[PDB]
Amino acid sequence: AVDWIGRNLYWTDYALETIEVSKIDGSHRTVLISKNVTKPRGLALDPRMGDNVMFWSDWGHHPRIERASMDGTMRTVIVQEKIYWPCGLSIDYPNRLIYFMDAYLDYIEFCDYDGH
Amino acid sequence: XXLXXX
Ligand SMILES: *[C@@H]1O[C@H](CO)[C@@H](O[C@@H]2O[C@H](CO)[C@@H](O)[C@H](O)[C@H]2NC(C)=O)[C@H](O)[C@H]1NC(C)=O
């Protein structure tokens, strides 16, 4: 996921079990989130000023979809109840909804930024 | 199909 406003590049690594950020040209690279990350696949961003949040999905032994600030500070879990294999994320910017899918329960769902 | 991409 690219950050068209901040000019940054985000990606999730399955083998390294990390979430990393770098400039658009890839000049500077750091590991953003590695604490409770097991199998990150999905990733989405809302760079518009005032939201500045990022989303990712993990399908480890306790699968969940987590929200955090795009600097990785305010990390929180929004969806943890009815997911087995979270696979792929996307954001509906005008309505501020996040669309996510599951490959084990086989559904497509959408939800707001707070999980409600 | 196994979920692992590799
Ligand atoms: C990483 O995961 C662990 C385990 O879920 C978290 O530890 C829990 O933290 C909550 C509060 O957020 C407590 O209510 C639980 O009792 C804790 N469990 C244990 C066994 O310690 C930990 O907070 C998470 N850390 C990060 C950085 O996300």
Resolution expressed in Å = 3.3
Paired tokens of A43 = 């990733």
Q: Is the CB of A35 under 6 A from ligand 1?
A: yes
Q: Does B3 contact A87 at a Cβ distance shorter than 8 Å?
A: yes
- The count of other CB atoms within 10 Å of the CB of residue A64 is 18
Method: cryo-EM
Whole-angstrom Cα distance, residue B2 to residue A111?
A: 27
Q: Is the CB of A61 under 6 A from ligand 1?
A: no
- The count of other CB atoms within 10 Å of the CB of residue A62 is 11
* Neighbouring C-alpha atoms within 13 Å toward the C-beta of A30: 7
Length of chain A: 116
Whole-angstrom Cα distance, residue A80 to residue A105?
A: 14
- The count of other CB atoms within 10 Å of the CB of residue A87 is 17
Residue A62 contacts residue A107 (beta carbons within 8 Å)? no
